[PDB]
Design an enzyme around this catalytic site. Structure first.
Site, mmCIF file in Angstrom:
data_model
loop_
_atom_site.group_PDB
_atom_site.id
_atom_site.type_symbol
_atom_site.label_atom_id
_atom_site.label_comp_id
_atom_site.label_asym_id
_atom_site.label_seq_id
_atom_site.Cartn_x
_atom_site.Cartn_y
_atom_site.Cartn_z
ATOM 1 N N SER A 130 0.865 -1.204 0.000
ATOM 2 C CA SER A 130 0.000 0.000 0.000
ATOM 3 C C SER A 130 0.918 1.277 0.000
ATOM 4 C CB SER A 130 -0.951 -0.010 1.207
ATOM 5 O OG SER A 130 -2.215 0.580 0.968
ATOM 6 N N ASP A 154 0.857 -4.131 -4.131
ATOM 7 C CA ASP A 154 -0.357 -3.310 -4.352
ATOM 8 C C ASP A 154 -0.193 -1.867 -3.860
ATOM 9 O OD1 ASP A 154 -2.707 -2.795 -5.717
ATOM 10 O OD2 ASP A 154 -4.050 -3.756 -4.203
ATOM 11 N N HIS A 221 -6.672 -6.436 -1.826
ATOM 12 C CA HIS A 221 -5.538 -5.556 -1.560
ATOM 13 C C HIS A 221 -4.346 -6.333 -0.946
ATOM 14 C CE1 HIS A 221 -3.515 -1.843 -1.134
ATOM 15 N NE2 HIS A 221 -3.592 -1.762 0.196
#
Ligand SMILES: *[C@@H]1O[C@H](CO)[C@@H](O)[C@H](O)[C@H]1NC(C)=O
Ligand SMILES: *[C@@H]1O[C@H](CO)[C@@H](O)[C@H](O)[C@H]1NC(C)=O
Ligand SMILES: [Ca+2]
Ligand SMILES: [Ca+2]
Lengths: 416, 83
Positions: A130, A154, A221
């Site tokens: 992230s 991701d 995710h």
């Protein structure tokens, strides 16, 4: 000396293979003594885990899983977990801005390692999830010399999608930058995962919009982590991703080549292929570990006497190999028509072995519609071979809601 | 030493292959024979080609007996009934 490192907020904990969960020992920048206390192997490679945003200010479930997988694959290495939970627990635009400073904190620590102990940057692999991915990017653009590799698990999309190279993870950030986009669902700038390619190699598992077994609000995710964990734990059997023009072109089985680096490995085992332009790469996965599936391009020419068209038609293909078999694989075709060739992708979890038999079924006042098919051409991605299946009798009759048409292998061509 | 092998797709029991092709270096001649029931009756087919990898096998795939055979001799890939 700790008089110049005092302004660094982020903590760098060196976890052991036997202590994965806690941040027991800390490598304190400026305090050279600490490095020895923590037993840092100066002859080994270094991994740095940079987490993303966390509303609780706590390490997620995946941190001790990623640590433990890195120590299963590389048990002599050094695994550092970059603690930035105080900055990560905030409002998203705040934590996002904080990447600019977490990146610096890291770069400063790395640079100190190379200066104080002459540690090679070519021995450093950063792994960010992230927001953590961009922190890694920023850090990489700030280290004295270029770090070995940066894995983007991701990378966060909002405020980064439209961001210029320095403010986000980009290919200039390391010698090699591999990225896993797993949750690109949404409008540009409004998807959890970044959509655009940001690495040297960008993988889009299942077209990267969302993930198998996900439609617990961070399943698609987080899956980029577990795909990398899968890659470390199953080093001998990695998933292959293939360089394709679009996800739509992938689902038609048009991209399934390995020629001129047009395919690579998903995860640790990745071949470090720096390309002129960022290469978007696609593949399909399972819902759980191990995620590898086998990809096949099936070409069918639907021949017949009278012209007919049938929209959104349902079929079931069955593959019979030497090792095993996978029956009743379902698929649908936008249109099927007289004297026309249709190519499509078919994937399966089963290692069937060398293909021998292939059974095609068409799923259902009037006599059922039907086509006469002589040959089926199959291209098997993983094994890079072209297999021809041809009807035992002159032609096999595939008629809607009837017995499945049978085809047996008649040719093999290994493409290399 | 290179091989010229028979190259014919899915031929019936009583049909001898005419086509031949000099294989790429390292290839072995092969024959795949099928024997099972069809809508017509009990049919036997035989396909032949040059193959980079060849593992001889015999498996009964959903009622049909499939037999793979390998041979490093030129024009050796001929079914057992035609030799
Ligand atoms: C450091 O790593 C190497 C592997 O590259 C290993 O052989 C060596 O034993 C390790 N040293 C220590 C102190 O464990
Ligand atoms: C399809 O092609 C065959 C020859 O390959 C021909 O005999 C047949 O009439 C064609 N059908 C149509 C609908 O054009
Ligand atoms: Ca950058
Ligand atoms: Ca069965």
């Amino acid at each position: 000396q700790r008089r110049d490192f005092i302004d660094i907020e982020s903590k760098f904990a060196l976890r052991t293979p036997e202590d994965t969960a806690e941040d027991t020992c800390h490598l304190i920048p400026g305090v050279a003594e600490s490095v020895a206390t923590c037993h840092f192997n100066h002859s080994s490679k270094t991994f740095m885990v940079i987490h993303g945003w966390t509303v609780t200010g706590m390490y997620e479930s995946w941190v001790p899983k990623l640590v433990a997988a890195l120590y299963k694959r590389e048990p002599d290495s050094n695994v550092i977990v970059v603690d930035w939970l105080s900055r990560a627990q905030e409002h998203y635009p705040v934590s996002a801005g904080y990447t600019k400073l977490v990146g610096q904190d890291v770069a400063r620590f790395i640079n100190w390692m190379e200066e104080e102990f002459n540690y090679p940057l070519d021995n450093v692999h950063l792994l960010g999830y992230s927001l953590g991915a961009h922190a890694a990017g920023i850090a990489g653009s700030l280290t004295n010399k270029k770090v070995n590799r940066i894995t983007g698990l991701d990378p966060a999309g909002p405020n980064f999608e439209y961001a210029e190279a320095p403010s986000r993870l980009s290919p200039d950030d390391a010698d090699f930058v591999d990225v896993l986009h797993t949750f690109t669902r949404g409008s540009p700038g409004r998807s959890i995962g970044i959509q655009k390619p940001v690495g040297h190699v960008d993988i889009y598992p299942n077209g990267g919009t969302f993930q198998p077994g996900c439609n617990l609000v961070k399943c698609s995710h987080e899956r980029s982590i577990h795909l990398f964990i899968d890659s470390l734990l199953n080093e001998e059997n990695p998933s292959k991703a293939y360089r394709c023009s679009s996800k739509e072109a992938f689902e038609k089985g048009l991209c399934l080549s390995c020629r001129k680096n047009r395919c690579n490995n998903l995860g640790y085992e990745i071949n470090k292929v720096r390309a002129k332009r960022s290469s978007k790469m696609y593949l399909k996965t399972r819902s759980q570990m191990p995620y590898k599936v086998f990809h096949y391009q099936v070409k069918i020419h639907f021949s017949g006497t009278e012209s007919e068209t049938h929209t959104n038609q349902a079929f079931e293909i069955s593959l019979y190999g030497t090792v095993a078999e996978s029956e009743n694989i379902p698929f649908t075709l936008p249109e099927v028509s007289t004297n026309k060739t249709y190519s499509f992708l078919i994937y399966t979890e089963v290692d069937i072995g060398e293909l021998l038999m292939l059974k095609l079924k068409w799923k259902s006042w009037w006599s059922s519609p039907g086509f006469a098919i002589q040959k089926i051409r199959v291209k098997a991605g993983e094994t890079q071979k072209k297999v021809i299946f041809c009807s035992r009798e002159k032609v096999s009759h595939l008629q809607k809601g009837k017995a499945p048409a049978v085809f047996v292998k008649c040719h093999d061509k290994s493409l290399n | 030493v290179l091989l010229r092998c028979y190259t014919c797709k899915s031929l019936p029991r009583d049909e001898r292959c005419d086509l031949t092709q000099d294989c790429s270096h390292g290839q072995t001649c092969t024959t795949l024979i099928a024997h099972g029931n069809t809508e017509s009756g009990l049919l036997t087919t035989h396909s032949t080609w040059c193959t980079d990898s060849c593992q001889p096998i015999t498996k009964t795939v959903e009622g049909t007996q499939v037999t793979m055979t390998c041979c490093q001799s030129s024009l050796c890939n001929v079914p057992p009934w035609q030799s």
